[PDB]
Amino acid sequence: SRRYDSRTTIFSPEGRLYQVEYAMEAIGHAGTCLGILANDGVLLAAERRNIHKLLDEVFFSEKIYKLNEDMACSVAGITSDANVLTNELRLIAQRYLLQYQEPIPCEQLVTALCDIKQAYTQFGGKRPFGVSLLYIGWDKHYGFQLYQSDPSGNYGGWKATCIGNNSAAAVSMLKQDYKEGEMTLKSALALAIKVLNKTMDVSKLSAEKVEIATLTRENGKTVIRVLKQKEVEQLIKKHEEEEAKAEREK
Amino acid sequence: YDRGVNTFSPEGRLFQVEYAIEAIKLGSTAIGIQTSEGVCLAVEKRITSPLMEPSSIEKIVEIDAHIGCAMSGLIADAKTLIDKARVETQNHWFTYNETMTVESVTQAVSNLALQFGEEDADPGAMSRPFGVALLFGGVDEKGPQLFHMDPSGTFVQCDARAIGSASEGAQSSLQEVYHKSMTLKEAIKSSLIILKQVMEEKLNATNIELATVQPGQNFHMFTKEELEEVIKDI
Amino acid sequence: SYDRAITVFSPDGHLFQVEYAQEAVKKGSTAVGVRGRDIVVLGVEKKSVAKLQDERTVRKICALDDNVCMAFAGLTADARIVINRARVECQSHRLTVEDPVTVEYITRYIASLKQRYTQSNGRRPFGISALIVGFDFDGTPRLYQTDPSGTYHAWKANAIGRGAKSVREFLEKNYTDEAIETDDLTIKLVIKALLEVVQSGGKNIELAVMRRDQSLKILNPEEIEKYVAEIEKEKEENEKKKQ
Amino acid sequence: SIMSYNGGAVMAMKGKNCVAIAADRRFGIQAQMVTTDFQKIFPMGDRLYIGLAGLATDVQTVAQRLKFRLNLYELKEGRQIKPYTLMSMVANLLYEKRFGPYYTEPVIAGLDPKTFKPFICSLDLIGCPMVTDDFVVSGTCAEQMYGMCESLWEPNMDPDHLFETISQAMLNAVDRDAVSGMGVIVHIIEKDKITTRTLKARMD
Amino acid sequence: TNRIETLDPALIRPGRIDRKIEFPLPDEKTKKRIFQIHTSRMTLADDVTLDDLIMAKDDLSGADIKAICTEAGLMALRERRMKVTNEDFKKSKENVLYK
Amino acid sequence: TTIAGVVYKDGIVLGADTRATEGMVVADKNCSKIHFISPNIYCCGAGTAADTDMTTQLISSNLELHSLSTGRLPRVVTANRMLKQMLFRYQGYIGAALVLGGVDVTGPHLYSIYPHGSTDKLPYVTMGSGSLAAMAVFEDKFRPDMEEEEAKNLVSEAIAAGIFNDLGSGSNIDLCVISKNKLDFLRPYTVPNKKGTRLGRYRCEKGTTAVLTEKITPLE
Amino acid sequence: AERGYSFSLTTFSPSGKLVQIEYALAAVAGGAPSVGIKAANGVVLATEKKQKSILYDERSVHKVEPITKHIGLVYSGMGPDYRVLVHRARKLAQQYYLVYQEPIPTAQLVQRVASVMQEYTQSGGVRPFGVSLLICGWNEGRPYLFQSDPSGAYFAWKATAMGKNYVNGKTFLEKRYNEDLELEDAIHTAILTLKESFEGQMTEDNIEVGICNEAGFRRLTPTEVKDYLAA
Amino acid sequence: NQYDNDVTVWSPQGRIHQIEYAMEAVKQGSATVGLKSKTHAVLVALKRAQSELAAHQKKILHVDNHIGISIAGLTADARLLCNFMRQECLDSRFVFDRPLPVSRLVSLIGSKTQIPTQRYGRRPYGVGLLIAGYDDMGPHIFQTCPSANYFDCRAMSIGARSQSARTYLERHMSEFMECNLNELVKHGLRALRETLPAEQDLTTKNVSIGIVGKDLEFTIYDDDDVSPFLEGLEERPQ
Amino acid sequence: MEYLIGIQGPDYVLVASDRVAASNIVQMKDDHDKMFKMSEKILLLCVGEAGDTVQFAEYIQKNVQLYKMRNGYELSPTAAANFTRRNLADCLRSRTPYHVNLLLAGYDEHEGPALYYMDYLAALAKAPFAAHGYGAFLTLSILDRYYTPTISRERAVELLRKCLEELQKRFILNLPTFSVRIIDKNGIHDLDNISFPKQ
Numbered sequence A: 001s002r003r004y005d006s007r008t009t010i011f012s013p014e015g016r017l018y019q020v021e022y023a024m025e026a027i028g029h030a031g032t033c034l035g036i037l038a039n040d041g042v043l044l045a046a047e048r049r050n051i052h053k054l055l056d057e058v059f060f061s062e063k064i065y066k067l068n069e070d071m072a073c074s075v076a077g078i079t080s081d082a083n084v085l086t087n088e089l090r091l092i093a094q095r096y097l098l099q100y101q102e103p104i105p106c107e108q109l110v111t112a113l114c115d116i117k118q119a120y121t122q123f124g125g126k127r128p129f130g131v132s133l134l135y136i137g138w139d140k141h142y143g144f145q146l147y148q149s150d151p152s153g154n155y156g157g158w159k160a161t162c163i164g165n166n167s168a169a170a171v172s173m174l175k176q177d178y179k180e181g182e183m184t185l186k187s188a189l190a191l192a193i194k195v196l197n198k199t200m201d202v203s204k205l206s207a208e209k210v211e212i213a214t215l216t217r218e219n220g221k222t223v224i225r226v227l228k229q230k231e232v233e234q235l236i237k238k239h240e241e242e243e244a245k246a247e248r249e250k
Numbered sequence B: 001y002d003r004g005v006n007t008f009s010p011e012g013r014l015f016q017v018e019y020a021i022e023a024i025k026l027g028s029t030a031i032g033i034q035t036s037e038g039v040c041l042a043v044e045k046r047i048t049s050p051l052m053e054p055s056s057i058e059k060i061v062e063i064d065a066h067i068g069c070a071m072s073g074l075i076a077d078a079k080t081l082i083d084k085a086r087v088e089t090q091n092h093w094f095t096y097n098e099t100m101t102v103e104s105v106t107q108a109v110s111n112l113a114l115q116f117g118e119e120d121a122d123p124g125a126m127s128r129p130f131g132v133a134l135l136f137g138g139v140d141e142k143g144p145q146l147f148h149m150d151p152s153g154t155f156v157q158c159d160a161r162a163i164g165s166a167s168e169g170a171q172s173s174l175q176e177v178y179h180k181s182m183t184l185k186e187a188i189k190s191s192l193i194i195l196k197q198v199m200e201e202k203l204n205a206t207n208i209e210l211a212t213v214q215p216g217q218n219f220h221m222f223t224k225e226e227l228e229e230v231i232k233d234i
Numbered sequence C: 001s002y003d004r005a006i007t008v009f010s011p012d013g014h015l016f017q018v019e020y021a022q023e024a025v026k027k028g029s030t031a032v033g034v035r036g037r038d039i040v041v042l043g044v045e046k047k048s049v050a051k052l053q054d055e056r057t058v059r060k061i062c063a064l065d066d067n068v069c070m071a072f073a074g075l076t077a078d079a080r081i082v083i084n085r086a087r088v089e090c091q092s093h094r095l096t097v098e099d100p101v102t103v104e105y106i107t108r109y110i111a112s113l114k115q116r117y118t119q120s121n122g123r124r125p126f127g128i129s130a131l132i133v134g135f136d137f138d139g140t141p142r143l144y145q146t147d148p149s150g151t152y153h154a155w156k157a158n159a160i161g162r163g164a165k166s167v168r169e170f171l172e173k174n175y176t177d178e179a180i181e182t183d184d185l186t187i188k189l190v191i192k193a194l195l196e197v198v199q200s201g202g203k204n205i206e207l208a209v210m211r212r213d214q215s216l217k218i219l220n221p222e223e224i225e226k227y228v229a230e231i232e233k234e235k236e237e238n239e240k241k242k243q
Numbered sequence D: 001s002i003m004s005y006n007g008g009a010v011m012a013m014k015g016k017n018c019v020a021i022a023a024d025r026r027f028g029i030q031a032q033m034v035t036t037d038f039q040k041i042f043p044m045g046d047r048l049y050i051g052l053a054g055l056a057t058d059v060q061t062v063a064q065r066l067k068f069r070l071n072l073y074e075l076k077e078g079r080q081i082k083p084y085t086l087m088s089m090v091a092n093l094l095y096e097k098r099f100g101p102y103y104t105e106p107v108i109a110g111l112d113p114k115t116f117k118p119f120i121c122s123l124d125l126i127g128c129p130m131v132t133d134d135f136v137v138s139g140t141c142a143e144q145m146y147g148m149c150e151s152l153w154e155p156n157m158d159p160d161h162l163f164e165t166i167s168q169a170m171l172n173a174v175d176r177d178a179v180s181g182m183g184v185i186v187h188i189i190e191k192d193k194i195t196t197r198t199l200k201a202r203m204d
Numbered sequence E: 001t002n003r004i005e006t007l008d009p010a011l012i013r014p015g016r017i018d019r020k021i022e023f024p025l026p027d028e029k030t031k032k033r034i035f036q037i038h039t040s041r042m043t044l045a046d047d048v049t050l051d052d053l054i055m056a057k058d059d060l061s062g063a064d065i066k067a068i069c070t071e072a073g074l075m076a077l078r079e080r081r082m083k084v085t086n087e088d089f090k091k092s093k094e095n096v097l098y099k
Numbered sequence F: 001t002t003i004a005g006v007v008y009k010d011g012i013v014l015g016a017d018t019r020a021t022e023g024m025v026v027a028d029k030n031c032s033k034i035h036f037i038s039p040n041i042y043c044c045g046a047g048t049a050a051d052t053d054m055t056t057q058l059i060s061s062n063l064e065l066h067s068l069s070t071g072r073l074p075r076v077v078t079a080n081r082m083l084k085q086m087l088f089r090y091q092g093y094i095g096a097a098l099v100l101g102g103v104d105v106t107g108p109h110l111y112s113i114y115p116h117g118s119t120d121k122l123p124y125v126t127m128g129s130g131s132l133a134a135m136a137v138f139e140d141k142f143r144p145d146m147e148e149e150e151a152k153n154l155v156s157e158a159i160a161a162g163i164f165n166d167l168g169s170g171s172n173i174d175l176c177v178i179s180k181n182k183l184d185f186l187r188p189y190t191v192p193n194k195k196g197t198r199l200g201r202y203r204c205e206k207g208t209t210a211v212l213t214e215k216i217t218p219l220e
Numbered sequence G: 001a002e003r004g005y006s007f008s009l010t011t012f013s014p015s016g017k018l019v020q021i022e023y024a025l026a027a028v029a030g031g032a033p034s035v036g037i038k039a040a041n042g043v044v045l046a047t048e049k050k051q052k053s054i055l056y057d058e059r060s061v062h063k064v065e066p067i068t069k070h071i072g073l074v075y076s077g078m079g080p081d082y083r084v085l086v087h088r089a090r091k092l093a094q095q096y097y098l099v100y101q102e103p104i105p106t107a108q109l110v111q112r113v114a115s116v117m118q119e120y121t122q123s124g125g126v127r128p129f130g131v132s133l134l135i136c137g138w139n140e141g142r143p144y145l146f147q148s149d150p151s152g153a154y155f156a157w158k159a160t161a162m163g164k165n166y167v168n169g170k171t172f173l174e175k176r177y178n179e180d181l182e183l184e185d186a187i188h189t190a191i192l193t194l195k196e197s198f199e200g201q202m203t204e205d206n207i208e209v210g211i212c213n214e215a216g217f218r219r220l221t222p223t224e225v226k227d228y229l230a231a
Numbered sequence H: 001n002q003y004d005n006d007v008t009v010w011s012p013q014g015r016i017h018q019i020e021y022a023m024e025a026v027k028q029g030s031a032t033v034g035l036k037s038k039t040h041a042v043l044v045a046l047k048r049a050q051s052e053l054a055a056h057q058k059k060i061l062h063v064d065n066h067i068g069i070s071i072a073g074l075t076a077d078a079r080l081l082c083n084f085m086r087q088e089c090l091d092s093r094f095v096f097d098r099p100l101p102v103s104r105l106v107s108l109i110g111s112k113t114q115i116p117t118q119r120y121g122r123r124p125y126g127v128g129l130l131i132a133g134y135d136d137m138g139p140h141i142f143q144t145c146p147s148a149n150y151f152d153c154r155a156m157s158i159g160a161r162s163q164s165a166r167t168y169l170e171r172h173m174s175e176f177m178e179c180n181l182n183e184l185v186k187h188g189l190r191a192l193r194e195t196l197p198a199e200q201d202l203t204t205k206n207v208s209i210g211i212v213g214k215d216l217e218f219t220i221y222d223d224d225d226v227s228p229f230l231e232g233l234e235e236r237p238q
Numbered sequence I: 001m002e003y004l005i006g007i008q009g010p011d012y013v014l015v016a017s018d019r020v021a022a023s024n025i026v027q028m029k030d031d032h033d034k035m036f037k038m039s040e041k042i043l044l045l046c047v048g049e050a051g052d053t054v055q056f057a058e059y060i061q062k063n064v065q066l067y068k069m070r071n072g073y074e075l076s077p078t079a080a081a082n083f084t085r086r087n088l089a090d091c092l093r094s095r096t097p098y099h100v101n102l103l104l105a106g107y108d109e110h111e112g113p114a115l116y117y118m119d120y121l122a123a124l125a126k127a128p129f130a131a132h133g134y135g136a137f138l139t140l141s142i143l144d145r146y147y148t149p150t151i152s153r154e155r156a157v158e159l160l161r162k163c164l165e166e167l168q169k170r171f172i173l174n175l176p177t178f179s180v181r182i183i184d185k186n187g188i189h190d191l192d193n194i195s196f197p198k199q
């Protein structure tokens, strides 16, 4: 028993938690997923790793989970652990609703899940959840929001960010292109198609390779929609027709 | 290799308990002297900076009005035992309407000795011994008593005892100067002298803490001025 | 449940997990605090200015009650846990006792919690250190600090995190009764101390201040820029017009 | 009785490709009225309403836990709930407290979200389900409502006649019950729209 | 060694190895000297500001900085240029660091 | 409620009426009282309605598991065991009165199960408020080894006796016929009751009900 | 006396891999092959039930198991583990049915089963299941074919293969199979893709086939399999 | 070295090393000797001090009016078992209103101490006992080991350098059954004395004596109450 | 026995409560406060059993304060009301039920002024005005007679005086003094006590 215990919840001599770091490495090898905030909405756009000729497409998405009437999340890492965490997120949000009869503020939902992940890092002797999440939502306190959480249970709010493979490239590109206070859903969609086009290993980029979701506010209700393949192809064509346009100038 | 916290050495010793005893050797040194006029307790504060408020260093605490305690080693571990001691004294007063004898309190705290272990235990039970040495100084029906306790759980009555890093030196010095008819003044004086000998910084009023328990007076922690009056007579 | 001793004694009598926890603290953003007369200021260093980042969501200065604020250095998640627990206890103190909360009390609570996690089966020490800052009823301003061991002490001024030794030396040499004679001077002292470890900016300094029975005030980077400006001015009107 | 402590009345009625659910609006404690706008009918989806009469605490609490479970259902599966399924879900929820039951007798009214075929039903306080092709009632004026609905209800009614029918039934039944009334609200739901009306009623 | 956690204590102990020195990963000043030193011995466009690069990477060491310095070289030699520009370092940064 | 059960030469005939009453008002005129347990086992339920519904669903579930696992058809003894043990465990607080019937490897089998957990294996049973009428019909006109149509006639006669002589029973008659290789879930057998035709037309014309407020919500 | 090991046996490697899961997958990709095809009007599962002697009675254990009346299962990997998962899936299905009085949707049963599988990658003292499951179902007119692997992850397939030589089977399916196929043609191509590996004379007792149309899930009788294997 | 750290691990040669190492903890304790006449049971114990300014560890503990014990080993385990024995005795008086027979108390201690030698991460009790008692079957001296084994002794000694005492006692067994109390305590004191170098000897400061008998409840003598026994010995010279 | 009363205006909530703490047949306290601050803009008026009122109210109070310290913004009076109602309803069928009747007054920066009525059975009801106690039976009608939804706070205080005077005239319980608070956009304001200077 002392022999077989891998000791997962323990400091390394430099002052770090090995299983958390390793989990972050696992995350690095997952499908790219990025999120951009705007003034009239917020969007998630993710690389699809489930891209094979025999896949049947029976769900509304692959990497975009709807958690609450105002709020939705995308994931990166081990998918089963994502199913666990998403179930638990659902539960949290519905509990808040049962207690306060009003939707849960996004930050509280994120904290509530992050405390679970942290718990897993501190005690129990279990492996941590090899999952990072991006959370998009809206609430009556801070409006449109984008958050991100890591397997350490540590989270943070962003105006735009990325997660998964080639995350850092995507982050740098966003540091170039972002537009604080001057962002729109249209512009952000362009940016998404751009960064996705550069970060994805397989260039040219088909709609069969990407998944786009937007969260917007229409007449007092919150709408979360996954873009149909047609609109996506329109976006891609727009990207190429802009790219072949700026190359003429020489 | 990894063994359990409840393993014996071939020599007959629990490695955790020994290691804890080792852990005491790093604590600030403390001196207790038993005397027919009362018991005195001194400890060096070991301030690591002039910026650190030294009044927030208490290595001497009141377990009850007639029982004080001086601690050496891992202070955080000491707090738990001190709390348990306080609660124990109060429960005995609650139940029997009389104060605790120093030996009874000492024993009570010493029962939390080897109460550590992995499997076959509560989920909130201790993982390792207490890395702390205590000196309980009190007054009861048997008069002035002083006890010493270590992480082995063995507690023993002592006439004059030192715990801490300068335990050996200070204990020798104590042996050279102790007799079962000293005055409390001579005891305090001696303590401050030995303390000055062993201390790394220069002995002053905000550098050690000193407390007495006499039969007619409840536990008394010496103020800055009261300390100055004694350090004056170096 | 998992009942294994993680924190145990080493043959030289050390708790190694506690030491590694303290390392984790040593890898933290720098945080300092000084105590004034009618102001207490805590400032925290690298906010990891990623610019596409919401600062509000990454603040390392939280409030425990209207009376007490706190900074930290170490593992942010562990800090979040400890902070929330401390908050609960701050309120339960007001339930069980009509009097509020003293900074020493909540310090004592937090300390005991960390120590508890150093000596329970299955658990792993929280890898944070905290600067607890407040004004107690009676008006005396107080600043304490805790540690992954569970030990705690009061300070006039202190620093934790990356390059805490440097800032601590500086504060040792610069904390006087002349400095921190005015609010504007205590805040100035903290900015002066923080500029001696920070990445040279001003957009990478957060400063929060608490004062009398008023609530916590966080400084917007405009005011921070102003203070660092008067700083650079005095660093060129008393250091330039001399050497 | 416990059910008469707050009073109240809920009725549901089938039409052609439409369905209707009505309730009085009184929140009263025994003889005394406290408010006249109390909600007894809760939307559990587009085109699916649940009507709760009984003890107002359990009205609110059953509605809330039902919305709990329902939200979870609609998230796990990617669809609104079917009315049969809602009925069985309510039944389960009520029977969970078989030995300290909620004092509500729910009425469900709604259209199959795949088809359009109307569904109405009612349940015990312990969740015995009961589906009909005509009407269902619950509350302190159950006898009255039965008497009106047996005499007014025709089979294939169009939305206007469903309206007139359920309105007259509720009004005349409720106006002979001391602890029901203070207004009547009627939701007639069809495939294309949902009409909510508040009738002119006595306030005594 | 990069990782001192995999050394036998017998080698680390003193006697055998006394002075134990660490090599921190620049920051904002050292890098300036490192960048200035690596770009000061070449036709580095006096336009750009080594700063942009310094504040660029997250914790880039004294190498990555050198790679960017060199990257431009090949950029420079590529499109036939004796004086690198901006993108040259950019492509370098994104060509080395990122990738 | 009047439920009845008989054993004939080739199997089992169950009968039930269709009225459900709340106090002394008919709440359901077309209540289904004969529950599916397994393909070969059916159960009439009287007593506390909710408890017979949920009892019988629980047992249906466990038996589906059991047949799925065994790969064979459930036995009627199995249903009887499950029910009677669960019911005894609850000490009659679960007001389930049941007529359990089916066809096995061992043939046809009819148990009556009382809420306290007692059972009886009998050739003919009745349960419910109308049970003594039906039992009179059986004790007068039952013979062993009847044929199917004879048994159907007898059962429908007993249920009728219940319907017309008990105020707790009424409306239609439902039969369930179970043989070694046939299942006739006739519902309803024969409605000996009709609501009289409305002589008057109390049709209310549009606008006859006063409205304060309207609210149209368009859907899709 | 006994308790339970409380720590995870499945842990992240420095590369970020859950090594035990990949080794469990190695155990899957060592079991007898199984192919599943979703075909417009229904679903076909087939597997190689090849014993090791005339002594084994093939009418005693089956590999194509029913979960309910409308959902069916086959596996690749370790037998016992499959048995456990099948019991548990039947139980889950019946929980759902108690609560909603409506037969469980195939996707939901797949979710639940997958959750069970994921538990044994994080709960203490255990190994993951060495089984991949193919789950067929009929719900809401459409047919459904899912796969769940030992990690607890699940995927929806039009057609797929698991077990030994699953790659070549998969390619063969990609080519020699497409939509607009009736169940009969799907059974045909299923036995065809199973024949791409069945070393020996494929008899009516060497393979097991199950179908799932909008009449319920069922195992094909040995007779029916013989008639189909006449091709 | 892989068979050293756990009590649940048999060695390839049929032994359990944690139990033996645990038994070695008994030899680390100061020596104590226990002998019986036909009417009395006597424990004599060499107390022991850390420094000269510290009191001597107490070594004889009172359990019930008819039972006392002498300890050798970890004092915390000693007190653990001692509280258990006192509790059992009180339970016996509570329920039966008769003193608990010594042999049964000992059996209980065997049962209690056997348990942790069989479960992982538990350790054996690091303490050996001599139990002096009187019941309806007369005086008794029992010995308990960390191995959870126990023995009914006619006389015994345990602790460091107790081999000497064991030898002496083994010589004068034939005398004991007819000795008077003073002579019995004397023999115990001599046995205890042979467990010292010629340089150091018995004192009223490092000796405790304990007597129980047919007309005497268990009693402990120390300090000056011991002097009447010591002042009555032959100054054994080297 | 205790009296509570709340009158919601277009942009304010007026609340008033008796100041008597009574035991047996005697008034033991005449400056007792029935009100509880929960937020800067929420008042909880609790009445009922001896121990349950303060235990419950204080529990709710601590949890609201906790929400404020945990999230940085305050709860809305609606979220608060449903929170208290959930807590009260969960304990109703438990070993330790709470016999409390309550009002919850508040002001949200968005949805405006709100007044919630709660029975001890934990039924939540929004109202323009309400009251708790036996006195309510004599006062509600007066409010029905003289409340208009556009009522100014001056007129509100006057109307309140009408109710309290009615109490003075008909009610057999004494009730000489009344705490009066008003909540608006700017927070909780204490108004001078409505009293009837008996002795």
Ligand SMILES: Nc1ncnc2c1ncn2[C@@H]1O[C@H](COP(=O)(O)OP(=O)(O)O)[C@@H](O)[C@H]1O
Residues within 6 Å of the ligand: E002, E034, E061, E062, E063, E064, E066
């Ligand atoms: N700050 C710096 N100043 C000068 N050269 C540097 C600096 N940082 C990196 N380099 C260059 O990069 C190389 C890194 O080698 P080294 O420092 O030995 O790394 P490692 O120890 O990992 O091999 C050196 O050859 C050096 O020339």
